[PDB]
Structures are given as structure tokens and as C-alpha cells.
């Protein structure tokens, strides 16, 4: 039932209710020509409005998952599914054949449309859609590999054997929520080295190892 | 004298003179709060003004080199220099230690500042600067490896031996200008496979092979 890549705690959400009246948000609403509740949170635009938010260090960074998805979906290997788990626990499925906008502003608009319409389609074919399941459900039947600095050292030919779920954080700061780790069930923690790497770099390195083994 | 990565024909330029009076450009100038001549060409904003441009299929795509630079500079391996050759033949040197903005709009602003001021600095240290040389000069003393689909099949341990210049196009469509190829001098053409891949994917794959050999 195949492998999957799952981006965890992706920094992807609409502007939270309680900051929608802030001047920085109202100003962006005017510039964008739509209501605050429809706009994706982006700390390059909304920073001054975000002071009161919980876990703020994780929030307002849709650029991270944008770039990771672009690279991953550019792979010529088509034997995996792609999911995005958001900071708020929502599950988005991305059809392996989806061509995402390469321009960040166009990506943001597409994500806004996704949050509004709940699915993006090519006629009868679904390209991107929220699923009414949790993180625990998309890792069913797959060996979960959680990439974290504190993890262990393993041979990739062994790691990327059968059906795997490659799980990489897509947020800029902090550690995984305890809830996220509980949802993963059984998992193996895998480290690439003694330093904190970016989501994009980890995606790149893991994709390369994955293709080495599996394309093969 | 070390290896280098060179992004070729990067789609990075200010709005050309002859389209500065177009309504789409004047509208963006108002939104940005500065003169057309200072604004980076971006076909997600300026498409309708670009109809009369030569080699238009290559132009207005700074997102491509943005993402490739982010990934490359995220590498933990510090034994290489980084250059960007633009569509107009300009040479930009990027200090290996530079942290580029991850947000595309902030990157665009930094590139606009670079074109205006000609250098970006951390006090006395240069982070990014135009160099008064040509493409032929930055590949002096290095084995040029030009990544193209029509190239040959080689072992990477042999390819990435001594001082190399890894050259990857950073434009969306078309083929290299003949002038660009002439500037490279002696070079080996290297193919990754029988398909056209994105700049980001090629950067990722080559970086991974480079690190395998050299980090080692
Ligand atoms: N050394 C490493 N080995 C394996 N994965 C790593 C890694 N460094 C970062 N990652 C992965 O890259 C993601 C983005 S970094 C997220 C913030 C980070 N926890 C600090 O502190 C992480 O969530 C993790 O999935
Ligand atoms: N199969 C392949 N093998 C090696 N490099 C490739 C490749 N496919 C694309 N590239 C590299 O990726 C860059 C971006 S693609 C640029 C447009 C492309 N010439 C079409 O047609 C190219 O300029 C080249 O440097
Ligand atoms: N690439 C590292 C692997 C590693 C991973 C985590 C560590 O804590 C240490 C080492 C090496 O070969 O050394
Ligand atoms: N990765 C390819 C290499 C290749 C490159 C260019 C080609 O035209 C063909 C094959 C392989 O192992 O088959």
C-alpha cells in the first residue's frame, strides 16, 4: 500500500480569530481585497499582529512547506503518496501528480482556496484535499521514520525497505508537540547528523537516499 | 582553490527600460512604493507588460534561483563558493556564509537592493556582490561540469574529484545561450536521466552526490 512522505506541523493556517481586528491584519486585508478570515497567516506580513498567539515561534511560515513540497513532487519516482499535517492537526492529501505553483504568492493563494473550498480538482480528479482523519490514520500500515536531530544512526537500505512513512517537520522553531509524537504510534527516530538542519535540506537528503534505494 | 556552484542564466533582472511605462508595471510601482527601474522583473506581477520582450520564456522567474540557493547554502559542507550568472551576463558572488531570506518577497527586496547598491555587507564583510568579471573568469582553474539532459553518463566519484565548477541552469524554459556555452571553455556535459528535471531537483541531486564524495 506504498510509501508516503508526511510533513509534520506545517506552518499553514488562516489568520486566527482573535487577531483579525489588528491594524496589520486589516491593512493586509485591504491590500489583498478579501476578509482577514480568508487570508493565510504569514509572518512577513502579519508579524506585529501575532504577538499574542500561542506557540508563535512555529507559526506564519508557509514558505517552508512550499519549498519542501516543490522539491519532493519534482522527483521522477512516483511510488509514494504525499501528506501535509498542519500545526492545528488537519490532514491534507496532495495527489502525487499535482503541479504546485512555484511562485510563493501563487502558492499562498492556492492554499487560501484550499482552506475555503476544502478540495482542489482537475475536473473529476482530486489534486489536493483535506481528509477527515488524523495523523494516526495516515501512518497506518507503514513503518514510521521520524527525522530528528536527537535520533539514531541507521543504514538507509534497511530503513527504506518496505512501506515507509517519512516524517519531516515543516515548521521553523521549537520541538514537535507531544500530541504529534503520540499520533505517530510505533516509530524510529533517525538523525542525519549532529546539527539542526532546515526542512528543505532534510527533504533533499532523505529524498536522495530514498531514490538511491527505490528507483533504485 | 576550491569547488564552486554556478547558477547559469538566472532569471534575475530589473524591469527593462522599454516596458516601464506599461500599466501593469505602473500599477506594481504604486503598490511597491518605488520607481519601475528599481523593481525586480517577476512574471507573476508583470506578465501583461512582458509581451514585447526578447527571450521572454526565460524571464521574470527569480523564484527558481531563490529556491536553489536556499537549498545549496543549507548544506553543512563549506568547501565551495557560490555564484549566480544572470540572463544578462552579470556575475554575482554569494558568500558561503550568507543566510538568504527564506520568504520569497523578502528575497526579491534583497535582490532589488543588491542591484541598486551592488553589494550587501555584514559590516566590513561582503555577503553578496556583483563582480566585474565574466562567466569565463569564475570557471578558471576548475573542471566545469554542465548539467544538461543531452549530456553523458558518468561516475560521480570521478566527476567530483578535484576542483569542480558545477553549473546548473536557473531559468524555466529554452536552452542555454550559445554565448553562455562559449564562456564555459572546456566542459563536460552531464545528464541525470532521460527527462527534463527542474533546477531545484537537479540542485538537490547534485548536492547529494557532491556531499557523498566530499564531506565525504
Ligand atoms: N539533524 C537532523 N537529523 C534528522 N532530521 C532533522 C535534523 N535536523 C532537522 N531535522 C528535521 O528538520 C525539521 C525542521 S527543523 C525544526 C526546528 C528544530 N526542531 C530546531 O530545533 C525537523 O522538524 C526535523 O524533522
Ligand atoms: N536530465 C537532466 N540532466 C542534467 N541536468 C538537467 C536535466 N534536466 C534539467 N537539467 C538542468 O536543470 C536546469 C533547469 S531546466 C531549464 C529548461 C530546460 N532546458 C528545458 O528544456 C537545466 O538548465 C539544466 O542545467
Ligand atoms: N552522517 C553522520 C551520521 C551521524 C548522525 C547522527 C550523529 O549523532 C552522528 C553521526 C556520520 O557519518 O558521522
Ligand atoms: N540514472 C540513469 C542515468 C542515465 C542518464 C542519462 C541517460 O540518457 C540515461 C541514463 C540510469 O541509471 O539509467
Swiss-Prot record, chains A, B:
SUPFAM superfamilies: alpha/beta knot
Annotated keywords: Methyltransferase, Ribosome biogenesis, RNA-binding, rRNA processing, rRNA-binding, S-adenosyl-L-methionine, Transferase
EC code: 2.1.1.-
Reactions accelerated catalytically: a pseudouridine in rRNA + S-adenosyl-L-methionine = an N(1)-methylpseudouridine in rRNA + S-adenosyl-L-homocysteine + H(+)
Site for Stabilizes Arg-61, residues: 63
GO MF annotations, alphabetized: rRNA (pseudouridine) methyltransferase activity; rRNA binding
Top-rank EC class of the record's enzyme: transferase
GO BP terms: rRNA base methylation
rRNA processing among keywords: yes
Binding annotation for S-adenosyl-L-methionine: 147, 169, 174, 192-197
Feature type site, description Interaction with substrate rRNA: 61, 99, 102, 106
Subunit structure: Homodimer.
UniProt function note: Methyltransferase involved in ribosomal biogenesis. Specifically catalyzes the N1-methylation of the pseudouridine corresponding to position 914 in M.jannaschii 16S rRNA.
Stated family: Belongs to the class IV-like SAM-binding methyltransferase superfamily. RNA methyltransferase NEP1 family.
Name used for this protein in its record: Ribosomal RNA small subunit methyltransferase Nep1
Gene responsible for this protein: nep1
Amino acid at each position: 500500500m506504498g510509501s508516503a512522505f508526511v510533513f509534520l506541523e506545517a506552518s499553514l493556517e488562516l489568520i486566527p480569530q482573535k487577531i483579525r481586528g489588528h491594524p496589520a491584519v486589516r491593512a493586509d486585508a485591504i491590500r489583498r481585497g478579501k476578509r482577514p478570515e480568508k487570508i493565510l497567516l504569514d509572518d512577513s506580513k502579519h508579524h506585529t499582529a501575532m504577538k499574542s498567539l500561542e506557540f508563535r515561534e512555529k507559526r506564519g511560515r508557509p514558505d517552508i512547506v512550499h519549498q519542501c513540497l516543490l522539491l519532493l513532487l519534482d522527483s521522477p519516482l512516483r511510488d509514494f503518496e504525499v501528506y501535509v499535517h498542519t500545526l492545528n492537526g488537519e490532514i491534507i492529501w496532495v495527489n502525487r501528480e499535482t503541479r504546485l505553483p512555484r511562485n510563493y504568492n501563487r502558492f499562498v493563494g492556492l492554499m487560501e482556496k484550499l482552506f475555503e473550498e476544502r478540495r482542489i480538482t482537475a475536473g473529476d480528479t482530486t489534486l489536493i484535499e483535506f481528509k477527515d482523519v488524523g495523523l494516526r490514520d495516515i501512518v497506518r500500515g507503514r513503518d514510521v521514520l521520524l527525522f530528528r536531530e536527537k535520533g539514531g544512526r541507521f543504514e538507509f537500505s534497511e530503513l527504506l525497505d518496505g512501506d515507509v512513512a517519512v516524517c519531516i517537520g515543516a515548521f521553523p522553531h521549537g520541538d514537535f508537540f507531544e500530541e504529534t509524537l503520540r499520533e505517530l504510534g510505533e516509530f524510529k527516530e533517525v538523525s542525519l547528523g549532529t546539527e539542526s538542519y532546515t526542512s528543505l535540506y532534510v527533504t533533499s537528503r532523505v529524498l536522495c537516499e530514498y531514490e538511491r534505494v527505490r528507483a533504485h
